[PDB]
Design a protein around this nucleic acid. Sequence first.
RNA 1: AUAGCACUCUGCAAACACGAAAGUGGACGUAUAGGGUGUGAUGCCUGCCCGGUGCUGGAAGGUUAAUUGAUGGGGUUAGCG
Length: 272
Amino acid sequence: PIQKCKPTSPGRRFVEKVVHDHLHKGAPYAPLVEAKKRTGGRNNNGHITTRHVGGGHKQHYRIVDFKRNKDGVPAVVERIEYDPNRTAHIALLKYADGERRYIIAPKGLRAGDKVQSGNDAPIRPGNCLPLRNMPIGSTLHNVELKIGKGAQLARSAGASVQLLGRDGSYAIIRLRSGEMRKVHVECRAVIGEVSNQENNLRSLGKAGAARWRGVRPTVRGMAMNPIDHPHGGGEGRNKGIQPVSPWGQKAKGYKTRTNKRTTKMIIRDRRV
RNA sequence: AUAGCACUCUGCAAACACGAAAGUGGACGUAUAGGGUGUGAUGCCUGCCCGGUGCUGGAAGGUUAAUUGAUGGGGUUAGCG
């Protein structure tokens, strides 16, 4: 319903959040949780390689089953949980033999629903099948690119791709960016669309909200000195230059793709 | 600086950054995500110009590198005188 908070304080005036009353409220499933540590955007040389990263709340990693290789064994959904590592919700699955796993929760999936994976899985949301066995025209998520590697495409909240056709050994899918591309027909995908589709309707409201998520402030190149940035310098406000990055790469319209090994797998570019 | 806004790049062995390389951060993330740029709650709004510079997409005419080596011109001497 997208609640807007009442302006009892200026930092609260513009806060907009979402309720999801069906999410589990207790602790996560301990055997599938492992420790994670903050990096600060620094690599093994100790240098900053990604600016504006640091701080934020402490988080545990949730072991999510992207491969879905427990074939032929039906499972039931126990609960839906909030995952701090991503924008989608996760679903805890209990299989018929007692094992428990985590999966990306499709939209509409609730406690008590049944899921399955394999060639003969029924066509239901949350079921995992090879693209060869998927009906043409369906909407899918968690698309896998290499056989046996697991889902890589369309995993964020509200994600989905469309299966437009399947010719030869390659299926044709349209991605959310607008790109049409081929995927080998033995790669697997999941029926349905990713949950939490209202994720992008939230408003943080204040700087502290971003600080809680671990984003440090961005400083414009215009505000610097010439030694720091190509945009730096000048008396007063003046741009006087075609915009570039701190390392001199143009920022408005200049294309940066250089890979030549995967070019054959893209059939229609989305006007990059 | 900021929440909010917009443009733009990036299909994942992602773009981007560090490094001589191996490798590492991005991210144990996957376009509702990540980087760069500008503007700066909110209300009402945001007009005209693509000639210049840049960017993006065309075109296969003119010009042009290495490479290749057709011809022509000389040096030398067996011989003829």
